């Protein structure tokens, strides 16, 4: 979608793998503000908004907190306190058709600097003076929605850069977007340390004959000591016994 109407999709209830994002080399710009790029896979957020558009390459730097410019002031403005990241990747071959693509257009003029995460579609003629426009384009009245101009042979700064700004919102509601939990292979008959889905413990993990109910995840004994657990993968019950200790 053109930058004058940036396409915003919300995402929730999904396990997001941001590792593939920065591990991929297609993206030219991966400036992430607020959150460390490596730690993105280890944070849980209530929801994530993906606002996508196409921009001129030379204006790609404008998409960030604290910068002014036509795209920043009149098309899409990020907050001063932004906790997210900005994917920006050149798409010269896809978006620059032969003869110049004119479908993508941007808002050059607007009476007031729009608030962060505001979208203005209204194709209303700008006053630009004291003249009553009355909906006709005059010397002072004109349409503030101009197409970029996308000839296939252009300067590299004028090429299409497709930009998606991932904005993470963490409300009071439970977080639904998280990174991959990851896993390790299981070792049975060794005094080890284990973290079964947040269950932190030590000991030897035998294969057990316990018949858990399907919903149950782990089992305690009398005096409430954890002595059994299903590994989340393969859904099989294990039996925990403490590492050998005694007096000498």
């Amino acid at each position, epitope marked *: 979608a053109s930058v004058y109407a940036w396409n915003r999709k919300r995402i929730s209830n999904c396990v997001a793998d941001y590792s593939v994002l920065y591990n991929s080399a297609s993206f030219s710009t991966f400036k992430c503000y607020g959150v460390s790029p490596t730690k993105l896979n280890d944070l849980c957020f209530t929801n994530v908004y993906a606002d996508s558009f196409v921009i001129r390459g030379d204006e790609v730097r404008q998409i960030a907190p604290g910068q002014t410019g036509k795209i920043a002031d009149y098309n899409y403005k990020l907050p001063d306190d932004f906790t997210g990241c900005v994917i920006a990747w050149n798409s010269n071959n896809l978006d620059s058709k032969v003869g110049g693509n004119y479908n993508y257009l941007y808002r050059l003029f607007r009476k007031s600097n729009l608030k962060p995460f505001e979208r203005d579609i209204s194709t209303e003629i700008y006053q*630009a*003076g004291s003249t*009553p426009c009355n*909906g*006709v*384009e*005059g010397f002072n009245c*004109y349409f503030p929605l101009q197409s970029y101009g996308f000839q296939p042979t252009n300067g590299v700064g004028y090429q299409p850069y497709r930009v998606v700004v991932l904005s993470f919102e963490l409300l009071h509601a439970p977080a639904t977007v998280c990174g991959p939990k990851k896993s390790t292979n299981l070792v049975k008959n060794k005094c080890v340390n284990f973290n079964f889905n947040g269950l932190t413990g030590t000991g030897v993990l035998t294969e057990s004959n316990k018949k858990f109910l399907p919903f149950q995840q782990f089992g305690r004994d009398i005096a409430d000591t954890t002595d059994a657990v299903r590994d989340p993968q393969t859904l099989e019950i294990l039996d925990i016994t403490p590492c050998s200790f005694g007096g000498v």
Partner: antibody, heavy 112, light 111 residues
Framework: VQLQQSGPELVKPGASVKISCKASGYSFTGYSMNWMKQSPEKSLEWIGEINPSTGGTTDNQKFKAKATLTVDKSSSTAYMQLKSLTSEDSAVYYC???????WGQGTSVTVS | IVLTQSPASLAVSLGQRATISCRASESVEYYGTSLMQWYQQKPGQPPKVLIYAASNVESGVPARFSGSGSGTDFSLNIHPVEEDDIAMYFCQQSRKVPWTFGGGTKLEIKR
């Protein structure tokens, strides 16, 4: 989307002529229909502005004397009628879209 | 507002960087927007428009055309000059009710 301007004139001094412009492929509703005067040597200048949506007439004060601007919704045309004619007011008259991205071919009104 | 165009005529070699200047009688910028428009007119041709305002350019005008300025001072920039860019270039203003054009800036291939 073109623009056409009709009529070469030779009318005697003191009269009035309504130069007509056919809008052709315009939308003729959201685009001001501007009137311009190119003096034969070089001098261009703005006659007046008409809002085809309503019919508002914003005209230059010095030429507000007897120049009037009319919009015709039926033919979507512009009629510029400059009452009273004199030798010096013999210049090319043009009609343009908005600021002038599309002009007419032009008429040579020659008070003779 | 009455504008003054300098120079009256200016010579270019094909592909030489070109600049033409206009001076305004009063301030043109109000509310952060300047409102002058400059035109090119080949002989026997309807004069077109190159700029919506102070600096920006209309669609259909080649990107080689540019311009900028503030207040009274304004100037174009025709960096690649070809045989087509041989004409007179006017400069408008839009502030006072009488909208006034300028004089004449003839572009000539230098020799």
């Amino acid at each position: 989307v073109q623009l056409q301007q009709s009529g070469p004139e030779l009318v005697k001094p003191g009269a009035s002529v309504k130069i007509s412009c056919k809008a052709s492929g315009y939308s003729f509703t959201g685009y001001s229909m501007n009137w311009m005067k190119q003096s034969p040597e070089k001098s261009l200048e703005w006659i007046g502005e008409i809002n085809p949506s309503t019919g508002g007439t914003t005209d230059n004060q010095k030429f507000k004397a007897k120049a009037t601007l009319t919009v015709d919704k039926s033919s979507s045309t512009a009629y510029m009628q400059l009452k009273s004619l004199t030798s010096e007011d013999s210049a090319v008259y043009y009609c343009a879209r908005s600021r002038g991205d599309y002009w007419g071919q032009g008429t040579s009104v020659t008070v003779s | 507002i009455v504008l003054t165009q300098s120079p009256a005529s200016l010579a270019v070699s094909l592909g030489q960087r070109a600049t033409i200047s206009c001076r305004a009688s009063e301030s043109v910028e109000y509310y952060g927007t300047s409102l002058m428009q400059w035109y090119q007119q080949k002989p026997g041709q309807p004069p077109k428009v190159l700029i919506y305002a102070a600096s920006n350019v209309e669609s259909g005008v080649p990107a080689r055309f540019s311009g900028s300025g503030s207040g009274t001072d304004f100037s174009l920039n025709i960096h690649p000059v070809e045989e087509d860019d041989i004409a007179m270039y006017f400069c408008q203003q839009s502030r006072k009710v009488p909208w006034t054009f300028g004089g004449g800036t003839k572009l000539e291939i230098k020799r």
